[PDB]
C-alpha cells in the first residue's frame, strides 16, 4: 500500500459529511482525493491517504534546516507520494521529484463603488464642463431682458448642457443594458487611492521584488514603501482586508484560491485581469521512487484527456455558491451625499451672512 | 402674457423640440449600446456570426476547441468546423494577415504572446481582447539524459527570480514597440468649441452695442 | 532555446526546463481610440 | 380519416388522397400590467430618500426667509441632484425595454443560445428532420 | 414546373404530391414609427 501524504485545504481535501462514521480513504473528499484515485488507478497501486501532521506544505526550518510539512514526510521516509496543491519550486525540486503540473496557476488580483458614477462622464469632461461653467459666469459678469449679447450666451450654454446631459443619459443606459463582466494590474499601478499588497513573505512578494517588467517593477516600488503596510500575515487577513476596507484595498494572491473564494458566500469578491505569472502544482515523489515515471505519465494523460479541466470545474464551479432586471441604490446614494453636503455648505454660508 | 395666437406657437414648438431632444438622446444611447455589442471576448464571439473567427488549421489551439467540454468553447467549435468559407488558416502569419485584410469581419484565435507582440507593431491596427482561454508555457529543451538539463533548468528559475525574464519580455515587446471602460472626451469636446465660439460672438455683439 | 511549448507528447521524448514564459489562447481583432466630431453629427442627421 | 401525415414509407404500403391540411415544424414557447414595473426602475429605497431630501430642502429654504446666494446654491445643487436621478431613471428604464425587445421568435433565435433549452419528440419525423438536415441553422 | 395543384386540372391530368408549398401572402414596400413608441391609447 502506497502512503499518500496530503493536506486539509479546500477544495483539494476536505472532511466528508459524516466522516466520523466512515473509515480510511472514505473520510475525505475533494479535487486531490479524486486525483489520487485516478493516479492510483492508472499506475495500478493500492493507497492510504494520510493528512500531514503539522498541516504544512514544506519548507526548511531556518534554525535546523530540517524540512517540515509534506516535503518532510517524503524526504524523511514517512510517505511514498504527495498529492496536494504543492507548488513546483527550485528549493523543493532539489530534494524531491515533481510530476509535470496537474494544475496551472498564477498571481492574480482580488477586489471587492461611487466610481460607477464618475465613469459615465469622464473626469476630464466633468472638469471642462466646470471650466466652461465659470467661463460663462465670467462672460456674463462682463455684460452687467433681451440683451442680445448675453442672450445668445444663455442660449448656446443651454444647448451645450443639453447635449452633455443627453450624452450622460445615453451613455449611462449602455452599461446597464449590455453589462459585460479596477480591471487590470495596469490600472492598479497607475493610482494610489486603492492600496494593494501581498502576503508579507513568500513567492508572491518575491515575484514583484525580482521582476524586471515595467508594470510589476512600478507595483513593487509602491508596495514596499506604502504606509500603512500593505502586507498581511495570512490569506484570511488579506481577504478580510479586501472585504472591510471600503474598496480601498486589493489583494494579490494565487489564482486558484482567488477563483475559489469568488465562488463562495458572501459572493462579494472577484478576480480581475489575467494571471500575472505562471507556476504549477505537481505530484511529488521521493528521490529514487519507482513511481516517478508512471505518476508523471498519468498526469500528462489526465491533462490531455480533459479530466483535470473537468475536475477543476467540478470542485470550483459545480460546487460553487455564487438577464438582469433591477436598479440599485448605491450609485444614486453618492449623489445624495453630495446634495446634503451642498445643503450644509449653504447652512454655513447663511450663518456667516447674518 | 396670454396671447393665445403666439401662445400655442410656443407650446407646439416646445413639444416639437421635446420630441427631437428625446430622439437624439434615445438614438445616442443606441450608438453606444451597439458599440458594445465589436468583439471583446470568446463569449462575444460565440454568440454571433457577423464576424467570422478561426484558428490555425492544425495544432493545439484547434484541438483545444475540438476537445473542450466547456459550453462557450463547444459552441465556438461547432460553428468553426462547419463555417464556410473556411475560417482555418495554414500559417499564423495568414491568420494575422486575414484579420488585417478582412475589414473587421475576421477574428483570430492565437497565442497571447504573439497577439500582444503584433499589437505593438505598425500598422498598429490589431488588438488583443479577452482573457486567455488556457495556460501553457515555453521551455528550453534538451535530449533526454542530457548533462545540460539540470543546470539549464536552475538557470531559468534564477533568471526569473532576478526578474530578468520580465525585463527581456518588456524590452522586446514594449520598449521596441511602435504603437479601460467608459466614454471619451472627443465628441464632448466638439460641443465645447461651439460654446466658446458662442461666447466670443456675444463678446463681439456686446462691444458693438456699447 | 525558442518559443517551444511544453506539451506531454514532446515531454515523453525530450527534457524541458520549467517555463521561461507563460501564454494562452487569446483573441486578435482588427481595431482603441476614435475621436471624430462626426460621431455627433451622425445621431441627428445633417 | 385522421391527422395522418403523407410520408414515403407509408405511401409505399397504403394509398393517400391529396392533403386536406398543410403543416410544418414550428416553435412553441411559453398580458402583463402590474404597476410594480414602475416601482422597480427607481427602487423603493430611492423614492424614499428623494422624498426625505425633498422635505430636507424645503426645510432648509424655510430657514432662509432674487440672488440670495445662500438658498441660491441650494436650488442649483438640488436641481443638479434631480437631474442625475431623472437621467438615471430614464437610462435604467431603457435597458429594461431594450432587453425586452432582445425571448425567442425563430429557429435562428433558438440556434444561437442556451439559456432556453429546446427539443423535439424523442422519435419521429421532427427529430429525424434535424438529424438529417444539411442547413446550417438546423445542423447547429 | 411551378404548376399549381387545382381541381380543374386534377380532373384531366395526375399531380404528384406537392414538391413546393406556398400560400397567399402580403407584399409591402412611415410616420407610424413615431405613433408606436407611445401608444395611440396613451
From Swiss-Prot, chain A:
Regions annotated as coiled coil: none
Subcellular location: Cell membrane; Postsynaptic cell membrane; Postsynaptic density membrane
Transmembrane region(s): 123-143, 148-168, 332-352
Binding site for L-glutamate: 85, 87, 92, 203-204, 254
Disulfide feature: 267-322
Segments on the Extracellular side according to the record's topology features: 169-331
Family: Belongs to the glutamate-gated ion channel (TC 1.A.10.1) family. GRIA3 subfamily.
Subunit organization: Homotetramer or heterotetramer of pore-forming glutamate receptor subunits. Tetramers may be formed by the dimerization of dimers. Interacts with PICK1, GRIP1 and GRIP2. Found in a complex with GRIA1, GRIA2, GRIA4, CNIH2, CNIH3, CACNG2, CACNG3, CACNG4, CACNG5, CACNG7 and CACNG8. Interacts with CACNG5. Found in a complex with GRIA1, GRIA2, GRIA4, DLG4, CACNG8 and CNIH2.
Its biological purpose: Ionotropic glutamate receptor that functions as a ligand-gated cation channel, gated by L-glutamate and glutamatergic agonists such as alpha-amino-3-hydroxy-5-methyl-4-isoxazolepropionic acid (AMPA), quisqualic acid, and kainic acid. L-glutamate acts as an excitatory neurotransmitter at many synapses in the central nervous system and plays an important role in fast excitatory synaptic transmission by inducing long-term potentiation.
Miscellaneous section: The postsynaptic actions of Glu are mediated by a variety of receptors that are named according to their selective agonists. This receptor binds AMPA (quisqualate) > glutamate > kainate.
Full protein name: Glutamate receptor 3
Section of the entire sequence shown: 418 to 840 of 888
Swiss-Prot record, chain B:
Extracellular side of membrane: 25-187
Feature type site, description Interaction with the cone snail toxin Con-ikot-ikot: 66, 158
Record site feature (Crucial to convey clamshell closure to channel opening), residues: 39
Residues annotated to bind L-glutamate: 60-61, 111
PTM field: Palmitoylated. Depalmitoylated upon L-glutamate stimulation. Ubiquitinated by RNF167, leading to its degradation.
Compartments where found: Cell membrane; Postsynaptic cell membrane; Postsynaptic density membrane
Domain notes: The M4 transmembrane segment mediates tetramerization and is required for cell surface expression.
Functional description taken from the UniProt entry: Ionotropic glutamate receptor that functions as a ligand-gated cation channel, gated by L-glutamate and glutamatergic agonists such as alpha-amino-3-hydroxy-5-methyl-4-isoxazolepropionic acid (AMPA), quisqualic acid, and kainic acid. L-glutamate acts as an excitatory neurotransmitter at many synapses in the central nervous system and plays an important role in fast excitatory synaptic transmission.
Complexes and interactors: Homotetramer or heterotetramer of pore-forming glutamate receptor subunits. Tetramers may be formed by the dimerization of dimers. May interact with MPP4. Forms a ternary complex with GRIP1 and CSPG4. Interacts with ATAD1 in an ATP-dependent manner. ATAD1-catalyzed ATP hydrolysis disrupts binding to ATAD1 and to GRIP1 and leads to AMPAR complex disassembly. Interacts with GRIP2. Interacts with GRIP1. Interacts with NSF via its C-terminus. Interacts with CACNG2, PICK1 and GRIP2. Interacts with GRIA1 and SYNDIG1. Part of a complex containing GRIA2, NSF and NAPA and/or NAPB.
Name of protein: Glutamate receptor 2
Organism per entry: Rattus norvegicus (Rat)
Taxonomic placement: Eukaryota, Metazoa, Chordata, Craniata, Vertebrata
Swiss-Prot record, chain D:
TM spans (from-to): 44-64, 69-89
Site (Crucial to convey clamshell closure to channel opening): 104
Binding site for L-glutamate: 3, 5, 10, 125-126
Modified residues (Phosphoserine): 133
Induction data: Down-regulated in the pyramidal cell layer of CA1 in the hippocampus by global ischemia.
Cell location: Cell membrane; Postsynaptic cell membrane; Postsynaptic density membrane
Superkingdom classification of source: Eukaryota
Residues marked Interaction with the cone snail toxin Con-ikot-ikot (site): 131
Tissue specificity of this protein: Detected in forebrain. Detected in dendrites of neuronal cells. Expressed in the pyramidal cell layers of CA1 and CA3 and in the granule cell layer of the dentate gyrus.
PTM comment, free text: Palmitoylated. Depalmitoylated upon L-glutamate stimulation.
Impact noted for substituting residue 8 to Y: Promotes dimerization. Strongly reduced desensitization
Family to which the UniProt record says this protein belongs: Belongs to the glutamate-gated ion channel (TC 1.A.10.1) family. GRIA2 subfamily.
Entry note about domains: The M4 transmembrane segment mediates tetramerization and is required for cell surface expression.
Note: The postsynaptic actions of L-glutamate are mediated by a variety of receptors that are named according to their selective agonists. This receptor binds AMPA (quisqualate) > L-glutamate > kainate.
Free-text function comment from the UniProt entry: Ionotropic glutamate receptor that functions as a ligand-gated cation channel, gated by L-glutamate and glutamatergic agonists such as alpha-amino-3-hydroxy-5-methyl-4-isoxazolepropionic acid (AMPA), quisqualic acid, and kainic acid. L-glutamate acts as an excitatory neurotransmitter at many synapses in the central nervous system and plays an important role in fast excitatory synaptic transmission.
Name of the featured protein: Glutamate receptor 2
Upper classification of the organism: Eukaryota, Metazoa, Chordata, Craniata, Vertebrata
Parent-protein residues present: 497 to 690 of 883
Amino acid at each position: 500500500t502506497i502512503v499518500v501524504t496530503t493536506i486539509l485545504e479546500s477544495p483539494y481535501v476536505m472532511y466528508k459529511k459524516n466522516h466520523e462514521q466512515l473509515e480510511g480513504n472514505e473520510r475525505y473528499e475533494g479535487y486531490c482525493v479524486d486525483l489520487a484515485y485516478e493516479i492510483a488507478k492508472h499506475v495500478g497501486i493500492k493507497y492510504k491517504l494520510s493528512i500531514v501532521g503539522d498541516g504544512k506544505y514544506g519548507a526548511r526550518d531556518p534554525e535546523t534546516k530540517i524540512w517540515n510539512g509534506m516535503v518532510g514526510e517524503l524526504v524523511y521516509g514517512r510517505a511514498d507520494i504527495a498529492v496536494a496543491p504543492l507548488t513546483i519550486t527550485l528549493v523543493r525540486e532539489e530534494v524531491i521529484d515533481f510530476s509535470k503540473p496537474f494544475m496551472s496557476l498564477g498571481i492574480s488580483i482580488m477586489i471587492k463603488g461611487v466610481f460607477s458614477f464618475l465613469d459615465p462622464l469622464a473626469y476630464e469632461i466633468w472638469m471642462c464642463i466646470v471650466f466652461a461653467y465659470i467661463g460663462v459666469s465670467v462672460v456674463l459678469f462682463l455684460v452687467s431682458p433681451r440683451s442680445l449679447s448675453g442672450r445668445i450666451v444663455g442660449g448656446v450654454w443651454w444647448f451645450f448642457t443639453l447635449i452633455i446631459i443627453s450624452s450622460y443619459t445615453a451613455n449611462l443606459a449602455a452599461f446597464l443594458t449590455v453589462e459585460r463582466m479596477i480591471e487590470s494590474a495596469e490600472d492598479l499601478a497607475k493610482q494610489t487611492e486603492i492600496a494593494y499588497g501581498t502576503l508579507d513573505s513568500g513567492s508572491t512578494k518575491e515575484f514583484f521584488r525580482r521582476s524586471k517588467i515595467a508594470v510589476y517593477e512600478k507595483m513593487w516600488s509602491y508596495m514596499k514603501s506604502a504606509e500603512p503596510s500593505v502586507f498581511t500575515k495570512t490569506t484570511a487577513d488579506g481577504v478580510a482586508r479586501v472585504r472591510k476596507s471600503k474598496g480601498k484595498f486589493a489583494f494579490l494572491l494565487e489564482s486558484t484560491m482567488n477563483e475559489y473564494i469568488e465562488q463562495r458566500k458572501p459572493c462579494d469578491t472577484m478576480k480581475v485581469g489575467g494571471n500575472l505569472d505562471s507556476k504549477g502544482y505537481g505530484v511529488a515523489t521521493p528521490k529514487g521512487s519507482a513511481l516517478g515515471t508512471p505518476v508523471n505519465l498519468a498526469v500528462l494523460k489526465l491533462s490531455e484527456q480533459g479530466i483535470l479541466d473537468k475536475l477543476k470545474n467540478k470542485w470550483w464551479y459545480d460546487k460553487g455558491e455564487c438577464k438582469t432586471s433591477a436598479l440599485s441604490l448605491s450609485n444614486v446614494a453618492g449623489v445624495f451625499y453630495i446634495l446634503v453636503g451642498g445643503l450644509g455648505l449653504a447652512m454655513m454660508v447663511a450663518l456667516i451672512e447674518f | 402674457p396670454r396671447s393665445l395666437s403666439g401662445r400655442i406657437v410656443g407650446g407646439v414648438w416646445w413639444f416639437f423640440t421635446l420630441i427631437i431632444i428625446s430622439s437624439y438622446t434615445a438614438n445616442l444611447a443606441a450608438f453606444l449600446t451597439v458599440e458594445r455589442m465589436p468583439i471583446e471576448s470568446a463569449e462575444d464571439l460565440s454568440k454571433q456570426t457577423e464576424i467570422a473567427y478561426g484558428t490555425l488549421d492544425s495544432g493545439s489551439t484547434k484541438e483545444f476547441f475540438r476537445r473542450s467540454k466547456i459550453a462557450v468553447f463547444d459552441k465556438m467549435w461547432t460553428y468553426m468546423r462547419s463555417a464556410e468559407p473556411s475560417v482555418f488558416v495554414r500559417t499564423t502569419a495568414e491568420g494575422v494577415a486575414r484579420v488585417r485584410k478582412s475589414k473587421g469581419k475576421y477574428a483570430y484565435l492565437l497565442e497571447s504572446t504573439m497577439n500582444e507582440y503584433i499589437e505593438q507593431r505598425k500598422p498598429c491596427d490589431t488588438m488583443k481582447v479577452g482573457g486567455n482561454l488556457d495556460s501553457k508555457g515555453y521551455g528550453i529543451a534538451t535530449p533526454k539524459g542530457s548533462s545540460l538539463g539540470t543546470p539549464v533548468n536552475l538557470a531559468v528559475l534564477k533568471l526569473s527570480e532576478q526578474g530578468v525574464l520580465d525585463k527581456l519580455k518588456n524590452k522586446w515587446w514594449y520598449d521596441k514597440g511602435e504603437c479601460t471602460s467608459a466614454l471619451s472626451l472627443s465628441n464632448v469636446a466638439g460641443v465645447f468649441y461651439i460654446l466658446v465660439g458662442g461666447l466670443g460672438l456675444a463678446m463681439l455683439v456686446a462691444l458693438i452695442e456699447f | 532555446i525558442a518559443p517551444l511549448t511544453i506539451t506531454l507528447v514532446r515531454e515523453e521524448v525530450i527534457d524541458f526546463s520549467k517555463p521561461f514564459m507563460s501564454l494562452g489562447i487569446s483573441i486578435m481583432i482588427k481595431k482603441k481610440s476614435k475621436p471624430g466630431v462626426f460621431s455627433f453629427l451622425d445621431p441627428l442627421a445633417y | 380519416i385522421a391527422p395522418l401525415t403523407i410520408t414515403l414509407v407509408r405511401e409505399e404500403v397504403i394509398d393517400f388522397s391529396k392533403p386536406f391540411m398543410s403543416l410544418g415544424i414550428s416553435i412553441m414557447i411559453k398580458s402583463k400590467p402590474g404597476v410594480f414595473s414602475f416601482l422597480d426602475p427607481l427602487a423603493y429605497e430611492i423614492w424614499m430618500c428623494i422624498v426625505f431630501a425633498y422635505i430636507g430642502v424645503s426645510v432648509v429654504l424655510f430657514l432662509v426667509s432674487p440672488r440670495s446666494l445662500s438658498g441660491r446654491i441650494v436650488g442649483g445643487v438640488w436641481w443638479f441632484f434631480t437631474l442625475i436621478i431623472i437621467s438615471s431613471y430614464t437610462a435604467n428604464l431603457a435597458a429594461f425595454l431594450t432587453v425586452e425587445r432582445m425571448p425567442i421568435e425563430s429557429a435562428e433565435d433558438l440556434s444561437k443560445q442556451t439559456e432556453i433549452a429546446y427539443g423535439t419528440l424523442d422519435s419521429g419525423s421532427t427529430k429525424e428532420f434535424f438529424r438529417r438536415s444539411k442547413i446550417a441553422v438546423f445542423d447547429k
